[PDB]
Structure 1
Amino acid sequence: RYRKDGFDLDLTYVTDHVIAMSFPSSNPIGEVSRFFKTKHPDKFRIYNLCSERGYDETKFDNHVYRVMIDDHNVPTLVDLLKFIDDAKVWMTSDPDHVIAIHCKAGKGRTGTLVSSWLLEDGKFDTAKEALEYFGSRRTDVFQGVETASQIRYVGYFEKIKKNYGGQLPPMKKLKVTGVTITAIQGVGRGNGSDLSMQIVSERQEVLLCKFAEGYNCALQYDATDDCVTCEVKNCPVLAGDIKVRFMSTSKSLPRGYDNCPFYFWFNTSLVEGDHVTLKREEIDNPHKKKTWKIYRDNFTVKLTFS
């Protein structure tokens, strides 16, 4: 909460030249507008991260760069890298240039980008430390952002800079052929029969599996091992950023974010070998401690690929 000089904004200097803030709305817009004309005349660039809301960009002299991000989701890796390219040019061409980033609460989407920016600028060596740092300033890696996928996408940026020269890795395309869920008991009906899995690529559903009925799958429940294994059929070739959503017909599995019990993003080119396994803290929704009597410590989701 910034107070000085007549302004009263939800607005924070993450560094002297990096600002995190809330939605400039109608923080009232004319005041956010006044603040920048007053404190940073001609030296600001605003990044609106909301896929869902825009505003009068003219209150900021039309220096607003848009990144379309869903609430509780992530930018495309491409948009993330474009953002970093754009912020870098602007930051490095004038010592007085300042960037300000927001969507709604200046929390999860916002932390995904400033944390990446902090890595690009060399303040931190690792995603975890940039994340903990934005956490300090805007309330632990989960102070930094809201979701595990948001954490993975900062990890993705780190790995791009360290292993791939600051550019996108070689292209890999996948098909999902299997899904495996451990510690199934207590999750829904506890045997996988209430679940279905949706694969989303470029905002389109690209495959739906329904476990009990064998809709694009075959379900196998093993109670000895407290797990379910599902053969996945008819997966189209996947490429880029993929979101995998699990839904449930069951009354006692709550929906967390994104209107489903649990979900996750990954990028097909950053997958290693034949599979990706996610621990509980690495899945979106089970990562929240209020759900740990449902998703126990050995709850995992594995996708198998070919």
Structure 2
Amino acid sequence: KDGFDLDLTYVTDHVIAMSFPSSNPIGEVSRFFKTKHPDKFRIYNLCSERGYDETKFDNHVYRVMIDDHNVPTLVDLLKFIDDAKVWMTSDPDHVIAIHCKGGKGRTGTLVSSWLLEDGKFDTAKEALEYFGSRRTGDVFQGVETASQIRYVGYFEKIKKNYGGQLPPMKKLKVTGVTITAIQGVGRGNGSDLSMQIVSERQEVLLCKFAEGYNCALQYDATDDCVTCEVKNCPVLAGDIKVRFMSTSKSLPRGYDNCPFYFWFNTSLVEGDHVTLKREEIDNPHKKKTWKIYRDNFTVKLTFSD
């Protein structure tokens, strides 16, 4: 419209999703907002990797450092909701524009959460699906990774069960991992696998199954599964990312430079373990990998503390 040719979408009348303003060239994204929404916009940059001259948007850019194919911290997500809320409710004409690189996975994570906050939807599934329709009914059009779906759900849970405020802190130690449908995955018995636990951007534990480096591996051919005792785990708090690596050539890497990974938040765990199915693990959630990760592929972390 009106001389503009932009990868930009009105998710609602006052919520916009878009691509990175590059040098979508930044000058025309700059014009667009100065023309269509003068003095009434706030840009959210969701890329940890890239920034720009924010003066082109009159310094109205707010940054969320999110890694490509990952999730914001819950703290960060909640802060974004607060910032957007204040801006949105201040003036009925105020508009928010949210972006990552593709205006896809990270973007969809905050937009669907914003849609929850704003009461347009009751459930994360509905919001995600709605964002998916506007951006392109499937939850995976909305965001890119299973952890991104989980974090929208986390926000749903916070809003519904914790009055929009952070839950009470729990801390955990990982004591065990079980992986089911191990056959056809890497070497098929877990010998090629290692697990890295990441908290606050740092490695906090590395386990190598074959060598028994911080672990003890057990392979059960009858049950087609691996159980691994995890040792030396530090106390874990907040948003934990668990990454699985392979030394095996037949196990390809998806996003995050590994075969498969996932995020969870310690306080939003229930009881004693978390079990993820195939469509809830990052990378195996993609149909292209389903002859490797079969439909009873599963990852379970066992906790204490």
Same fold by TM-score, threshold 0.5 exceeded?
Answer: yes
Deviations 1:3-28 (A, max 9, x none): x0000000000000000000000000
Distance in 2 of aligned mates of 1:63 and 1:142: 30
Deviation at 1:40, TM superposition (A): 0.3
Deviation at 1:188, TM superposition (A): 0.2
Which of 44, 49, 71 matches 1:47? Answer: 44
Deviation at 1:275, TM superposition (A): 0.1
Distance in 1 of aligned mates of 2:112 and 2:135: 12
Deviations 1:31-88 (A, max 9, x none): 0000000000000000000000000000000000000000000000000000000000
3-state SS of paired residue (1:15): coil
Partner of 2:113: 116
Distance in 1 of aligned mates of 2:134 and 2:69: 20
Deviation at 1:124, TM superposition (A): 0.2
3-state SS of paired residue (1:59): helix
Partner of 1:200: 198
Distance in 1 of aligned mates of 2:157 and 2:133: 24
Distance in 1 of aligned mates of 2:244 and 2:3: 48
Deviation at 1:148, TM superposition (A): 0.1
Deviation at 1:30, TM superposition (A): 0.2
Deviation at 1:227, TM superposition (A): 0.1
**Percentage identity across paired residues of the two chains:** 100
Deviation at 1:223, TM superposition (A): 0.2
Deviation at 1:98, TM superposition (A): 0.1
Distance in 1 of aligned mates of 2:133 and 2:287: 19
TM-score w.r.t. length of structure 2: 0.99
Deviations 1:212-269 (A, max 9, x none): 0000000000000000000000000000000000000000100000000000000000
Distance in 2 of aligned mates of 1:245 and 1:273: 22
Deviation at 1:90, TM superposition (A): 0.1
Distance in 2 of aligned mates of 1:223 and 1:102: 47
Deviation at 1:105, TM superposition (A): 0.7
Deviation at 1:130, TM superposition (A): 0.1
TM-score w.r.t. length of structure 1: 0.99
Task: Mark the runs of 5 or more structure 2 residues left unpaired by the alignment.
Answer: none
Q: List, as ranges, runs of 4+ consecutive aligned residues in structure 1 with deviation greater than 2 Å.
A: none
Distance in 1 of aligned mates of 2:100 and 2:243: 23
Deviations 1:77-132 (A, max 9, x none): 00000000000000001000000000101000000000000000000000000000
Partner of 1:15: 12
Deviation at 1:283, TM superposition (A): 0.1
3-state SS of paired residue (2:149): helix
Number of aligned residues: 303
Distance in 1 of aligned mates of 2:131 and 2:11: 7
Partner of 1:241: 239
Deviations 1:171-221 (A, max 9, x none): 100000000000000000000000000000000000000000000000000
